Tab-separated table of C-alpha atoms (C1' of nucleotides) in Angstrom:
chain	number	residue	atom	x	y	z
A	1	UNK	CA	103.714	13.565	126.750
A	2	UNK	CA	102.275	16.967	126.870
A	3	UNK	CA	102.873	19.231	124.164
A	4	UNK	CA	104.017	22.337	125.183
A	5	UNK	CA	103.885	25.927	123.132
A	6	UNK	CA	105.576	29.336	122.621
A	7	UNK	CA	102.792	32.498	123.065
A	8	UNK	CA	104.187	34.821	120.703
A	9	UNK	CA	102.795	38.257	119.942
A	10	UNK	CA	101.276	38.007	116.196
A	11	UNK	CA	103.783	40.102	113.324
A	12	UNK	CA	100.327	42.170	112.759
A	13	UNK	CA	98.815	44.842	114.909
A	14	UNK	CA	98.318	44.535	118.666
A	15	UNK	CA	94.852	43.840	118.325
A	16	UNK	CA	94.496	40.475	118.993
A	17	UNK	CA	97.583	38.688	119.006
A	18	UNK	CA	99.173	36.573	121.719
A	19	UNK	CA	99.053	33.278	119.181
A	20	UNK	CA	100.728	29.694	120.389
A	21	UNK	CA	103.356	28.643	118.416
A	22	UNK	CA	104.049	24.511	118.136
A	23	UNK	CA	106.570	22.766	117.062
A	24	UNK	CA	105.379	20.974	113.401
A	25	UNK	CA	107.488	17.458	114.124
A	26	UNK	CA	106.017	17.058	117.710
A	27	UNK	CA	102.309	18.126	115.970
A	28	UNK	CA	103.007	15.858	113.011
A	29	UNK	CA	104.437	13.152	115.257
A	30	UNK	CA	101.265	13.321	117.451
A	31	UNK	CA	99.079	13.140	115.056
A	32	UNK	CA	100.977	9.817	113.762
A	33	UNK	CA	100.225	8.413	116.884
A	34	UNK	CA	96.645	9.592	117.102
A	35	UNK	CA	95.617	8.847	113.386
A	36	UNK	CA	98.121	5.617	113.068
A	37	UNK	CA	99.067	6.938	109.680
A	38	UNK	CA	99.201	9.688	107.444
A	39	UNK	CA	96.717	7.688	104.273
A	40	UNK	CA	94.560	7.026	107.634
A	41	UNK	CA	94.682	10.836	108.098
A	42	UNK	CA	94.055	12.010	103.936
A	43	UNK	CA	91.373	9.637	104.348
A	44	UNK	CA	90.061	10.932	107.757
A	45	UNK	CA	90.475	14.265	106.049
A	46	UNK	CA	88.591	13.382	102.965
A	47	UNK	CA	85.636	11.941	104.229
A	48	UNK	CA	85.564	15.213	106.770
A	49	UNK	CA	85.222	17.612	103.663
A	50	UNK	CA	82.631	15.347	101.929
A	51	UNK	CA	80.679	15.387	105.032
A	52	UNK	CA	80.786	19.260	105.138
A	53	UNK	CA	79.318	19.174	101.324
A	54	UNK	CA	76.993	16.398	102.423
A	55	UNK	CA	75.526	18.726	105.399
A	56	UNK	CA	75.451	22.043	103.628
A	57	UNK	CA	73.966	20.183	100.521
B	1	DA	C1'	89.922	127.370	111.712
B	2	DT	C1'	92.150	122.793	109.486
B	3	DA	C1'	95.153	119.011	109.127
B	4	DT	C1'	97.532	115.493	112.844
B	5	DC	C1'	98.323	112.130	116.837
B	6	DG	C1'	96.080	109.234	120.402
B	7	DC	C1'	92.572	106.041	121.153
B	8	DA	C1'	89.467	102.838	119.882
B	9	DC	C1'	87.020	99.389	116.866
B	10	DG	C1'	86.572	96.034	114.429
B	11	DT	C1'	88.148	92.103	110.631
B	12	DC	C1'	91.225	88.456	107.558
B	13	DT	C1'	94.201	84.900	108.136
B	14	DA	C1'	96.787	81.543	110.395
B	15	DT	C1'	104.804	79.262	112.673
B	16	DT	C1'	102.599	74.070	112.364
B	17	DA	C1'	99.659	66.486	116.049
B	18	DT	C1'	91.863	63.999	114.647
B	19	DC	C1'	88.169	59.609	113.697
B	20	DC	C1'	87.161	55.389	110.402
B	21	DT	C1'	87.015	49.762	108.960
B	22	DC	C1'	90.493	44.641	108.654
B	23	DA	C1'	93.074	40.532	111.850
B	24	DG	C1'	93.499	34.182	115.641
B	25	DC	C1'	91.611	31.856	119.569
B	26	DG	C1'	88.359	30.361	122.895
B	27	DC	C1'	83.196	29.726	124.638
B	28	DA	C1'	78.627	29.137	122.656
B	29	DA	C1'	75.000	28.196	118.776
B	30	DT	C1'	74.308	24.229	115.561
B	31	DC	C1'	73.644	19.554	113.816
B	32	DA	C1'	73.808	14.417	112.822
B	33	DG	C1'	72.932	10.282	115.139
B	34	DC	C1'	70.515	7.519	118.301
B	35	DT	C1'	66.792	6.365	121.175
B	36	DG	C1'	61.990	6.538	123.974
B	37	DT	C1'	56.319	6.775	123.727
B	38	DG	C1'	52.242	6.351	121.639
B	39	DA	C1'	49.116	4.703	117.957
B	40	DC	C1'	48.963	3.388	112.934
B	41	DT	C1'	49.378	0.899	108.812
B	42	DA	C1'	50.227	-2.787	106.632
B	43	DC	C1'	51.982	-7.461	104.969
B	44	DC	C1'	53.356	-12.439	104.465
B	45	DT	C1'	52.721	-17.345	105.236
DNA sequence: ATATCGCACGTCTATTATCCTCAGCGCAATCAGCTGTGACTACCT
């Protein structure tokens, strides 16, 4: 299902606030579903960051 | 004839509300990967 958000004026100044708000257990539940697991997402995570070092290197 | 009030001529000081440089989120610059065209260079059995 569709995840749906909360567009909440930021605590800081007005300058650009206006941020979406999430619920964390529907995000972390999606991302369960995506990912399969959470080790499949440290993983996914992992390799990300050594890609970034790999492409700036 | 000499001090004295009206008028003027300025000048010092102020009972009082302005312009600079740090913050998420979405559209655009960036990149790895893959492939296509052409000739080249070479290497094993």
């Amino acid at each position: 299902p569709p995840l749906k958000f909360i567009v909440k004026k930021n605590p800081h100044h007005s300058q650009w606030g206006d941020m979406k708000l999430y619920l964390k257990l529907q995000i972390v539940k999606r991302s369960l579903e995506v990912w399969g697991s959470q080790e499949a997402l440290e993983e996914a995570k992992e390799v990300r960051q050594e890609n970034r070092e790999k492409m700036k290197q």
